[PDB]
Description:
Chain A is mainly alpha-helical. Helices cover 91% and strands 0% of the residues of chain A.
Amino acid sequence: SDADVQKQIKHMMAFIEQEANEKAEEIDAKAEEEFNIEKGRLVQTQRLKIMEYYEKKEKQIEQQKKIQMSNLMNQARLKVLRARDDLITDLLNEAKQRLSKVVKDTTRYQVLLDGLVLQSNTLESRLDLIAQQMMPEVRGALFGANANR
Amino acid sequence: ALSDADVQKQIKHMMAFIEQEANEKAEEIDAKAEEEFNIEKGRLVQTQRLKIMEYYEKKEKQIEQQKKIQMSNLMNQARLKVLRARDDLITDLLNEAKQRLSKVVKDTTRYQVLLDGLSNTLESRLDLIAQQMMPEVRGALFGANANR
Amino acid sequence: LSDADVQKQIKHMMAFIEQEANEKAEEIDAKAEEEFNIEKGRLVQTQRLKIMEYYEKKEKQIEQQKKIQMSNLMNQARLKVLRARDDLITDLLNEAKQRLSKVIAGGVSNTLESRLDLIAQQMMPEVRGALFGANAN
Amino acid sequence: EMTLAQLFLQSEAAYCCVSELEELGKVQFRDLNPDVNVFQRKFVNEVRRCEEMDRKLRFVEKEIRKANIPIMDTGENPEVPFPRDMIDLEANFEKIENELKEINTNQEALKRNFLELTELKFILRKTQQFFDEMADPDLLRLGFVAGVINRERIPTFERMLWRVCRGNVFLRQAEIENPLEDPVTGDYVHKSVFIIFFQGDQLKNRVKKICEGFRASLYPCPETPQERKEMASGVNTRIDDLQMVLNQTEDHRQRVLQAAAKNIRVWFIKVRKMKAIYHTLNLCNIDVTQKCLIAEVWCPVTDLDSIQFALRRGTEHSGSTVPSILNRMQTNQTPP
Amino acid sequence: IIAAKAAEVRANKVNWQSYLQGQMISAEDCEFIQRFEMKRCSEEKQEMLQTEGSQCAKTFINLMTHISKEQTVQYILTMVDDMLQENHQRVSIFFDYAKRSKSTAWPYFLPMLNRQDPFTVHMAARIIAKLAAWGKELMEGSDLNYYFNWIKTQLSSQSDSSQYVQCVAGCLQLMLRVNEYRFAWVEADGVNCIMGVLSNKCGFQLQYQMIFSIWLLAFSPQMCEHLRRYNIIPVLSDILQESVKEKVTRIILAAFRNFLEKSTERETRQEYALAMIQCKVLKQLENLEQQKYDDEDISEDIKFLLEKLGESVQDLSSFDEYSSELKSGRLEWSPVHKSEKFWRENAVRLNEKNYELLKILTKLLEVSDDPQVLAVAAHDVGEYVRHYPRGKRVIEQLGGKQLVMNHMHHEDQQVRYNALLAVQKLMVHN
Amino acid sequence: TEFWLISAPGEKTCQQTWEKLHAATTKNNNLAVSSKFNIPDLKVGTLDVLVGLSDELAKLDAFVEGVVKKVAQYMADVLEDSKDKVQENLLASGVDLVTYITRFQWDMAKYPIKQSLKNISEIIAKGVTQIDNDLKSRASAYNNLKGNLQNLERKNAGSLLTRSLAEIVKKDDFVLDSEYLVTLLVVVPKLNHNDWIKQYETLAEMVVPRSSNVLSEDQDSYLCNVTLFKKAVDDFRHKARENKFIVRDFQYNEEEMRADKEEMNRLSTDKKKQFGPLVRWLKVNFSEAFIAWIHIKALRVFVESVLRYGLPVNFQAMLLQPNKKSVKKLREVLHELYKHLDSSAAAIIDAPMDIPGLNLSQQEYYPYVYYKIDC
Amino acid sequence: SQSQGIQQLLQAEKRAAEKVADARKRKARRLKQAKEEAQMEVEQYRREREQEFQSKQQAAMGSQGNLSAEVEQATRRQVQGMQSSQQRNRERVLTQLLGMVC
Amino acid sequence: SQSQGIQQLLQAEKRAAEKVADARKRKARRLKQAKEEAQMEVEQYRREREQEFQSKQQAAMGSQGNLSAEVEQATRRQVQGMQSSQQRNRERVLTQLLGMVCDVRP
Amino acid sequence: QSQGIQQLLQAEKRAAEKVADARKRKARRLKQAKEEAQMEVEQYRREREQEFQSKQQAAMGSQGNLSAEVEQATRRQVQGMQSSQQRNRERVLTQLLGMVCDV
């Protein structure tokens, strides 16, 4: 009867609406899940890439600092060596001037020349020859011995 | 009438018709046999004709090759003969040259001059000079080669 | 039934047992004959074989020992006679040196000693042939 | 006064000659090869095909009776042509059978499709009628089916629906005036077109199986009024097309059957005589003894000449130069 | 009537001394004729021929030409025919006579064919034919052409006329048996004359002889290729269906075997096979195979003809044939249009070229006005629907449903039936 | 007992329908004892899955009925010694099963209400399946032990040849060092024992007269051992056939006799130790299976009651215990009173079969949800 | 006689069977003649081609003389041309050559 | 009447379709919001580490400057010490070298 | 009874003991016979060894006889060598010295 029609209408209405609401609630819950997992995925990936980038640049910076330090110390070492060499060469030129002085003394230069002749015997050569052989003794005498030897 | 004479005549007609049928079968089969014989004979004769033709065309090809080689050889002998005629020409020329040099060698003044200049026997000079001048001698005796 | 007659079947069974025991005893005696002879013969064959092999090895070692001593005796005979021959040859050359001095010995390296040695070392085959006869072979 | 006789007759003319006899009817043949059973004899092949031809005619004749068409009666009695007119008759009857069978099958299938499509048309029209409270929108959870039921099953069917898929399915029904013919059961019965609405898959299966059990028919239905109009127009055109084709094929059947009834009796007489003649030549001697057929016969004496005369006709009709020959013979066997 | 004439001539002996009395013949000819007539034994006849080989034909020719009486001519012709029949080799002697006369033997008898007595002319023709067939002389030249023309005239005569035509046909069979005379008769219009003689529906004997003539002429491949212009196959098949004598069927079947085996090219073979099939020889051959015969010749011929015809039908059924025909508008009920295997196995190929075949069919069904073409197109469309339901929508897509429905009420009943079948096939299922 | 659970769709409230069903029904006449069911508000789902369940809880009620009755059968068998008051030994709780059911309350601990209906069903299903397998296995093993005992008894039954003599034979009569002598026992019928004294002393041709002796003597037959030589075995048996005796081979299985006695003692002790365990297991498992069954009854009630009455829910179901032969009157009264709560425009009268398809109606349809408990 | 007539027909059929059998035997035997007689034709072919070949070989000798005469005339023309060309230019080549050698 | 129920049914179906479409829109919107929030957090971390990188660079520059100054001072001290040592032995070594040269010993 | 059973138990004990003693005496007899055969073989072998040693010693002297003969053969060959030399010594020396002086 008309009551029957209304009753069936109400029943199907209620159940279709409740099916809709149940779907809506399930969608909302899965949506919160998707919200969480999407934050997780995107943050994880982008953070990983950013960490990689920053860490790589930091490693490059540390390598640059190491190389810069190595160069600085090497230049310090070579500079002290060049100072030492300049000192020793100054000694040699002092010796050369001394020779040029003594040659003026005829009394001494006569004997010295007799000797050389009796022995490229230019003083500019003999001084070089003796000094290159004496280098160890001059090093030891000017700059103190080496303890580690 | 259906008398024994009529029956005999009708059976005789039957005999004649069966004879005709047999005769026609024999004629047909005989013609088929003849055509089969002809085609088989033609097939076999063709197969043998193949071999005969191959053999005798090989022989004729050898004869043609001999003809060609003979003609080529004859042309070659023509060419070599004309070349030999030219070469004999050149040698006659050189011989005239040596004879002329001999005739000069008597002229005392020229002989003295040439000796003053001069294995330097005039013959040696002539062979040496000729073996180098040959290109000009050819150019001047038989015209240049238009293809050059 | 009675004990006397039943003793009959009892004794028949006991005779069955005693006959089985006699069969076993005859088996033991057959062992002591056949297997005992087989074992003694195996032992005898083994002992005799080993002992005779050892005897033959000893005998062959004795015969080889005698063969070696005889071979060395023959060879030393041969080399002794060769030395005897060579000693004769040396005596001949020494006599030649003794006679040459009659004719260092002398000379001028052409000393008579050097010459004589050099000639004799070439004559040898001829000296051998002349003195000890040509080799028939 | 009866007498045996025997005929020598060339095979080529033999058929025609025995035919002339059959028309004459004053001759009684006898088996001359009883040694081999009838079902094995020489001409059996022919007789077999003859029988088959006869069957064909019977079948067509039967359809002739099934329809209202009458069967003529001329009175002519032509003779089967001795030459191989059998091939021509075989082709003719093969056509007059194959056409009739194809027409019958296509008529059946097309009637079925026409009825199904008419049901679909009525369903569409009534569903359109139901979707006419107020269709304000022009155009998915709800599942929807529709079909047709036999009237007076609405009470039981409605009860079953409300009892299985308890209180969760909606059904609307509408009588179909001008009752229709059943798709398969083939009877003019009243029908009601019904639309059922249901929630989800499980109830869909419930109602589908219920209707199938109630020997109903569903067919698809539109989902949108545009689809409804589209498919309604398509079905309305296809129904008329089917009506035209059905009328034309039925006219075709009527015409070929009329043509058949014009000559079915003469066809029967031809093929029957031809069967009888070949069955008779079975009774005569065969090439196992001679290329000329041998016949043995009872005849009354006085008709002999006539028989010979009849034989002559056969020769002339057969065109064989050789004549057939009739010979008497003194005999012992009993005359009939 | 030929045999009866021969028997009457043999019985009716006429004295040859009357001609000698009139000085119309040479005495030697009369003496030789008398000796031969008295010498009937095989040994006696052979000895007389060997001793008087040249004299025999000379005397016969002299008596036949000089004597106006038909009795002597008939007797001489009968004697010569008897000599040839007892031993066909005797021909050589006559040739020797022509060799002795330094002339062809045809001229001595060619005018004889114009003699009054039909029996005499036919006997002379038979003698000439046998002499040609068994000899080394290939008849040629104006005499050969005139002889062929005389045979043609005798054939045009077409029953005593039928009986004489039988002798003419026997001579024709004897001549055609040779290879060269085959081309000789082919070059002449004899093929047309023979086909016409068949058209007259001659007697059984004439029918057999003519069929044999065709069977012989079919042997040489060139003749088989050349004769196609006369389209014998239809007339021969009509005779085969009409007539029943075992001789006619055997000869015609052998003729078909020769035509289908001796053809020069596969193209001619396909042409002959199509001519047979469209003439419905396949069904007749099948029925004949159903029947039983005696000789292995007929059975083997039937089997071979059936095999070749079936292979040709299969070749015609190839979808390439259908596509070529559709491209050429050859919708004339070819074997493919009804081949059940063809449709069942290649209806899908109709989709080829982006519905090109279906478009062609639709265009033909829309424009074609020739009843045969329209009906063929409709039956093809129905076959396409029947053998592949998937195309139904495609047909409806092309509108072919509308065209077929329209053609259903077409003016030509032949088109109407095919259209009805196609429509019923199309509307079989939704 | 028979209990009928009736849906009673509320009628807008618990009072309006439950009161009329119980108090008014009792006041008009004590036709049946009324009680409230008090179903919990489970989590109703979609109508598709709800119908799927109204089929699953059609199947499972029968399956669990079968399992519980199988448990009842096992308790009737294994407890066959004291099967008196079998029902009381089965009660899940309370004093008796009837009391348990009338006071039934859903146990959330057994199954979680907050779960979904399919899951709540699976929870009962798994447990019941395990119960079924356990009843198949453990009861079968106890039956196997009882059958071993029965086979031992059967060995104790029958004649001496059919039975195993074992302890029956006297070991004192056995011949020690029985190398060439033995003892053969072939003696049965007492009808042929009229001269047994001489036969035993002379059964064979070398039989001992002293050692041979009788061990047992039945009313119809006698059993004894007689000494003979090693070779007199078969002949002795032959002689035994001569005196109409039966084969009584023993093979002096004294050690086997001791072993068999020990095995019988161990089997009896194992039965005593295991019946208590299996009986306890059945007593405890019956409570659980019955609880799961009543839970499935409740689930079926709720599923069918929602389906029949659209959401929201109202299922103050009444449990009625029918009186003596009051079924017809009570059912008619319920139908009359339920003509309104449910549609009277359908069903009720009759219906044809609809067997083809996924499901066909299996029970009678009534103008309410109706279910049975058949304790 | 009916038995006599039937026997007559059967004897005639036997005669026809003999006739067809004789024709078949002729065919079968003449197949071997087909195999054998081909020797005559192949021999005639061989002899014909041999005759033609030998005739060609014997007659081919002629062209040699004509070819020789033609080419010899050609070389004679060439040599006369070379000889004339030399005789024209000879003197100046000689005078140059001597001038250079001296 | 017979159609009124159908009207109600279709209207209810549309209500359900709308109420599920709304939830779908909410899901899509919240997914986009999640994407945005993740990106904003990524930006926060990126700028945090940029700041840290800048601090590290500043510290490295300062350390390098300090180290350069220290090592330069060390080298200057070394050179000064070398000069002071040499000034003490200049005359002795010089005399030794000059003497070795002047004494020839042919 | 018990006495009757014991009368046969004694018989069985004796039936076993006879075979036991048979086996024991068989072992003893095998040992004794093997010892006696071994002693016989060993005495025979020792006698053979003594005979072999004596025979080998005697054959040692026998071959020493051939050793002395080989010595005598050496002596004969040496004497032959000396005589053959003596025969031709003079002529060999004369020729050798003569061709030495021939320079």
